[PDB]
Each structure stands twice: as structure tokens, then as C-alpha cells.
Design an enzyme around this catalytic site. Sequence first.
Site, short mmCIF file in Angstrom:
data_model
loop_
_atom_site.label_atom_id
_atom_site.label_comp_id
_atom_site.label_asym_id
_atom_site.label_seq_id
_atom_site.Cartn_x
_atom_site.Cartn_y
_atom_site.Cartn_z
N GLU A 74 2.10 11.40 17.74
CA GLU A 74 3.56 11.40 17.84
C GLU A 74 4.08 11.74 19.23
OE1 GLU A 74 5.61 10.16 15.91
OE2 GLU A 74 4.82 10.26 13.87
N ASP B 58 19.12 2.25 15.24
CA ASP B 58 19.92 2.97 14.26
C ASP B 58 20.62 4.21 14.80
OD1 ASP B 58 17.79 4.84 14.32
OD2 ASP B 58 18.03 5.22 12.17
N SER C 198 19.52 6.96 16.04
CA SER C 198 18.93 8.26 15.77
C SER C 198 17.96 8.60 16.91
CB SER C 198 18.19 8.25 14.42
OG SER C 198 17.00 7.47 14.46
N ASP D 169 14.21 10.97 17.81
CA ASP D 169 13.04 11.72 17.33
C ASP D 169 12.83 12.88 18.29
OD1 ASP D 169 12.45 9.74 15.37
OD2 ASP D 169 11.55 8.51 16.94
N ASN E 179 12.97 13.05 13.08
CA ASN E 179 14.19 12.27 13.21
C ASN E 179 15.52 12.93 12.87
OD1 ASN E 179 16.08 9.85 12.05
ND2 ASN E 179 14.89 9.18 13.82
#
Length: 130
Positions: free
Chosen positions: A35, A49, A51, A53, A60
Site C-alpha cells: 500500500e 471519485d 477521495s 487514501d 480511504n
Amino acid sequence: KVFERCELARTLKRLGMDGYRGISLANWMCLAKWESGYNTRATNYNAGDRSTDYGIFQINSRYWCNDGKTPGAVNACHLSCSALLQDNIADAVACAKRVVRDPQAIRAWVAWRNRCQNRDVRQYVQGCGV
């Protein structure tokens, strides 16, 4: 902060992640590795969208933390997304635990399915004393 492998393994263990909801420490290490490369300040904007992370587990903003700029987002970990950018990962760990209390558990992160699921992850904790 960018953790060294074993430094993180022991940090996660101390935080109660070893076997949390049946998830081995090695799986959590594999997740953080893919990640963010064990980087607590990592961020990734998703233009699609709106958003973002955040942190070591790339949690998120749409459902887990509040950054105040994600349309109709919620805050299930009840934390400012800023809390996920700290060198101290205690809050990020509390939130990651919250994530896996949901129906999908560790599968919530697609990266885990792609790079960790059904794979030999022993390597991530080898020699760390955990």
C-alpha cells in the site's frame, strides 16, 4: 516516517495486530508494504471519485476518515484523516482494525487480494522476533 521492515513488524505486534480477527502479522506487513512501502505520510488522490487514501495502510476518506473534502463521505474510524499521517501509527492501527471488523475483513483492500492473498508472506516477518 518510513519504517524498516522488522521495526514495523514489532511495532504492529505491540499494537495488538498479530492475529487480530484471524489476520496474521505477516498479512498486515504485506498490506503496508504494497500500500505505501511502509510510509506513514503516503497519500493518493483518486480523481475519479474525489477521495484520498491516507498513510501506511492507505485508508480511504470516503468511508473511514474525515478530510472535509470528499463528497458525501463518512468517518467510520471517527478520526481526522490527518491522524493517519502521523509517524506514530497507533491511530492508523485502530482504524485498520475498524476496517477489518466489516464483512470483507482484510479483503477490503484490493492490494491485499492482488499481492498477498494465497501467497507466501512468511518472508515479511522473518528474523524480526515476532
